[PDB]
Amino acid sequence: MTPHINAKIGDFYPQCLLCGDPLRVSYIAKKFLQDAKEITNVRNMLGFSGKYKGRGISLMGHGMGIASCTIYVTELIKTYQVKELLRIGTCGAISPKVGLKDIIMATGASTDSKTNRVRFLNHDLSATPDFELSLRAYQTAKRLGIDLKVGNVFSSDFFYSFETHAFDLMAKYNHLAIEMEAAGLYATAMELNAKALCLCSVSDHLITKEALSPKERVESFDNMIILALEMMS
Amino acid sequence: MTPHINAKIGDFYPQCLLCGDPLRVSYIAKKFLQDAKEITNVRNMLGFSGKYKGRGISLMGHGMGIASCTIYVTELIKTYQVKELLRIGTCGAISPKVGLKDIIMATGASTDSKTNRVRFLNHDLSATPDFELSLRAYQTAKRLGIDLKVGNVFSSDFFYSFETHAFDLMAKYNHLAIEMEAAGLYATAMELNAKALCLCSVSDHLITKEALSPKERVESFDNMIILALEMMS
Amino acid sequence: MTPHINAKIGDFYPQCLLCGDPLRVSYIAKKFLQDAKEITNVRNMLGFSGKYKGRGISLMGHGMGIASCTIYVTELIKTYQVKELLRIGTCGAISPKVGLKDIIMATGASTDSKTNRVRFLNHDLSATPDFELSLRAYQTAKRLGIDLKVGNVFSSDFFYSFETHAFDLMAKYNHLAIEMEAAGLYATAMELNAKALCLCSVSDHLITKEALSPKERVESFDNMIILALEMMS
Amino acid sequence: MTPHINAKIGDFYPQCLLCGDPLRVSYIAKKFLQDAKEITNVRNMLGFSGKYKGRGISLMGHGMGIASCTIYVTELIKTYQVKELLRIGTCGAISPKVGLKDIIMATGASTDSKTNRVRFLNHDLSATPDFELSLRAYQTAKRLGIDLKVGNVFSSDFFYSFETHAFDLMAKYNHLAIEMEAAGLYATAMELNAKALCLCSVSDHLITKEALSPKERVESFDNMIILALEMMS
Amino acid sequence: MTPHINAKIGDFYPQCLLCGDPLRVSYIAKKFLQDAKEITNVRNMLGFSGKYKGRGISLMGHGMGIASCTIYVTELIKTYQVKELLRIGTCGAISPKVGLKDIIMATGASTDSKTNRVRFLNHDLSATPDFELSLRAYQTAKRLGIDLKVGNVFSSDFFYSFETHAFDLMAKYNHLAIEMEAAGLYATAMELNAKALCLCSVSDHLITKEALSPKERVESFDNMIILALEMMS
Amino acid sequence: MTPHINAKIGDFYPQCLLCGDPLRVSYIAKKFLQDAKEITNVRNMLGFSGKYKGRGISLMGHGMGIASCTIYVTELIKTYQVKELLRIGTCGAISPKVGLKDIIMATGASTDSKTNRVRFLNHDLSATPDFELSLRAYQTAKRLGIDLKVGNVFSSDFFYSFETHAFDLMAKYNHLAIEMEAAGLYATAMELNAKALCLCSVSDHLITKEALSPKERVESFDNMIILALEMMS
């Protein structure tokens, strides 16, 4: 009964899948969950609880940007007793080690945000996922025959960047792609002693310019969705 | 077209109202516009285009956070040729000079974000509205008998602050309230040579802990809405 | 009596016009103030009191630099009870939107100084003028037929800049000119709850390299001086 | 050959063991490798090469602090084409989740150094290990019967800290212990496309002041030396 | 014929004595210079070229603050070909190793300014005097029976400081007193390959609260002024 | 006793010479020190006490880099009552005013470390040596007819720099050469009221790429060593 989530308390299962687009959340709930109840809908930010192979599973939209993401993650932990957080979303590749439709497992989320220096003594916080969840992700991907790409992402405050000249430097330092949430998700989960991991699917390549099409965007990612559901059942 | 707005070119009027919650954006369309047409709905982030007193105006959601807000404003300006941006919203009061239901005109937006240092040579960018818009708001507010509070606001990356011990110092420096997007809106409008202004209603006082009833929030801000629409007439 | 001001409490009228050059302050007193009297002269930094159209007005020199200006404005406020500080000065144009002899009203003052981060929790202080004062300026200029240019200025710790390559970028962000005090005046006034406004005329254009001949610097600043005095009367 | 290593081309095996103390490296060579030979000794910083159950394996000292480590790691990768770097060492525990003789696998190395900001555009470099190396660490440990403690370390430029009051925040954010090299090891190997992992055993507990005996500080690490040798054979 | 000096190229001798207060500069020429001529007077900032006991020499006022001081010494070096700059002034003592009226030689100038980071790639520039002058100072003062105190000063952007709680720590780090110009002077001299040195007299003691009398602040400084004038061989 | 030093309290004299390389510390003991005894040897970091021309004297090695140096210097003062610390070593020249084998006295040490910002309120700490020590150095150096080069040094966290393009700038600002400890030793000494001074011999020129033979390495530095011992008597 927070300001951004109106679900009743208890309505969230201790395992939540996270994605930035509430319409993508509705799609997951309506295609992969059995008896999926919409439990929260403040600001059109939809959240659901259902079953996946008889296992109780929650979904929640988090919007775009570290600040938006931090709002919903914080409330899910502190009020709705969510213990494991699994985020999926797109990203723009910057590394030749990956290409369109690769699924990336963020074992680190660098950032141009000041948020973590505010959290952390104005020093460098290495925002990382929970290693247990990363182990389940790997084993689940190996099981499903998914070639999981593993490395850092860069979480930026900007979709339209003013440092495109820096993408090669980032790529060199093992940053496979750029998105806008992971470094906040990982900090919030570290702060509040929760388990979290981020997975993202290349939809665009910012160096090689390859960019998919509007409806490979709607089907290329069921692979990642299934991976996340499988590693929670 | 744009990854976050699926409106056709020219579906937006040159004057556009902004609010973080697409449901408030929706409320405003139904209650205050004539001949309103939904024009975009990507990621459930609704946008409309109607008429107020026969004059055509647009509305658009922008999410929570500088990062989110920067995405929508950028696209509104560069692609949909929006020229004037009136952002309304709510805020948490920190100054004794304002109370609940007060309307604040932000003539500066301080921030704990790094976005402006990145935009601006790692220096201090004084994020400010367009003066003419702020002159028109003050004139419009007198026309409507509205008592306009003018000062700075502080735009935080944190809804759940880790620096509540700092609120007195901010108010001492004429920060009336905290919100989370104005500094990005102002810097983006400055970047792209567009006219922006931010108004926000005190829904919560962070020092006296007074808060509006849910009934009040939902309808105590119509006067801000009318103010916004009247200065677009 | 302070370590930098020779006067007694009472010699300063509550409305004080400010200029960097003490000989320019003397020039204004001897030309525009009836019953011009000198009230302070520590470090050759001249201050005056007198009357303009029947209104008693004070004038004070603040030197060059944020740190210098900050000393005199802190003392005028804290010891000598000055309430309205109307700073005038010259400035180096960087925008194509202004030329020589234009008067700029600084509705924001960016800076490369660290002083505001030292004042304001290492975050971004958006240093701004009093909105009532700036409204008065605009109204007074329209009454007097003075075309007033409005935007941000950049207040630097450097007269001889090590970063001239950045001038185009500052101009892109609605920084019309560069001077060296407005960010300190605004922030000192914010800190101490006073009303401040900076105006400055273009004596040099840093881009086109246009400049004012040392004599046309004597007189073309009169319309700015009259504007300042007309809004204090 | 480099200014700090006088080993000859190809003297190192592609897999190298790292320890800050050269005399402990000599201990590892003496006690665990057949056919061991001393390949470098500049500044008395010893490197060895030998075999462990038939597999070629090198050892290298790297001194204390991010800067000293960075020197040796860089030269190992760029002049002796080391591929896999497995650092062992000691740390001071700041977490209640770990006690003396616990072995920590560093999924992330936060820091108060500026080196990573110098490397990485002044942003936040999330310094991390090669995931497969860490997965091999988890697998070997499970097979060897060793309970691996897993989480962030904080790599500091200060052995004698000036911010001990902040250790509790560091633990809150899942920093199990403090040492002085991991952040440089991880960033250097990210820079130069090498595979690196850092393990460290808890020799002291900075919160409960518990410490290990001078004999335990010779013998207790053998479980950690064996874990590392085993994941390289 | 700089913007801030109206002397003609030539009127400055290679050795120039600097004070913040030009009325103090006139006091110097009056009480110590034969043949003394006022050579510049822009902005009431007075430069004198006299002779000291037969030796030609120059005096110049630099104002208050690093920015002001930087304008003046840059123009002296770059246009008036000054080669040796020995600045005197007052300072606020902060260390118990000094008392009222001590003369301090600043072999180091720390600061809270951002100017040196702007000069020096955002790194820590160590602002220091020419060593040939600091030794000349030691030798002249030992000849003269002057007991010279030697250490670091803190040049601050703030006369009215916001960080008095830090005076102890600065003191612990051998900062004997606080002033506002030394770091800008040394840095400027360092940039332009000129010899500079700063002496400053304990007029006030910010710990004990002791202070000179109106009279001691006119006459006491003669010793430090004599030390300066002798050393300009 | 300390975690890094083996001597018992007393073995160390109050004047200690320091080199980064323990084989050079041993080389100095053997060649110049009478009645030399090895007092500490932890991690192969050697320390000695002997008599030079009558007076007792100590030597200590301190590894490479600020963090390592700081550990050893702190322990020498705080536990072993060392009061006079004389560091020697090598550097890479970047200034044309110095050539190979030149002996440089550092009057200040700039740095790209964050260590001093951490120590000193996030401001610029101007790291400097004891002026007395530097006086004996210049006096002794002139007695011995050793020609002493005096200027600033740049202490880096990177032996392999990512900013070689900046070398000209550093030299313009009177940084004669580059090393990796001076700023750290000066700040530790400043922190703990000890006397410190750094000399460094030019063994490589990073601009003209000139270098010294490995035989010159063993032998050329003998003037700088004697200079040290002649000023500790």
Ligand SMILES: Nc1ncnc2c([C@@H]3O[C@H](CO)[C@@H](O)[C@H]3O)n[nH]c12
């Ligand atoms: N260059 C980029 N390319 C593709 N996807 C993203 C994203 C992801 O998609 C969203 C932007 O539309 C955002 O929430 C983030 O998760 N950020 N930046 C991106």
Ligand SMILES: Nc1ncnc2c([C@@H]3O[C@H](CO)[C@@H](O)[C@H]3O)n[nH]c12
């Ligand atoms: N303490 C606070 N109280 C009321 N409203 C806000 C807001 C505004 O409301 C949104 C968060 O609910 C956010 O986008 C901002 O504009 N931020 N912080 C707030």
Ligand SMILES: Nc1ncnc2c([C@@H]3O[C@H](CO)[C@@H](O)[C@H]3O)n[nH]c12
């Ligand atoms: N490029 C420039 N051109 C004209 N005036 C100024 C100024 C103003 O003039 C003073 C220095 O000339 C300074 O205090 C500021 O008010 N700064 N930079 C300037």
Ligand SMILES: Nc1ncnc2c([C@@H]3O[C@H](CO)[C@@H](O)[C@H]3O)n[nH]c12
């Ligand atoms: N409180 C602490 N306790 C135990 N070990 C360390 C270390 C580790 O041990 C070395 C310090 O002697 C250093 O190189 C690092 O690897 N740093 N800080 C420590």
Ligand SMILES: Nc1ncnc2c([C@@H]3O[C@H](CO)[C@@H](O)[C@H]3O)n[nH]c12
């Ligand atoms: N607390 C203090 N006490 C005495 N003198 C000074 C000064 C010196 O006096 C000048 C103005 O106060 C200034 O520029 C510096 O030279 N700064 N701070 C001071």
Ligand SMILES: Nc1ncnc2c([C@@H]3O[C@H](CO)[C@@H](O)[C@H]3O)n[nH]c12
């Ligand atoms: N380019 C450079 N050239 C020669 N010596 C050094 C040094 C010095 O030598 C050591 C690096 O080998 C280090 O301790 C420092 O004192 N740092 N950087 C150097």
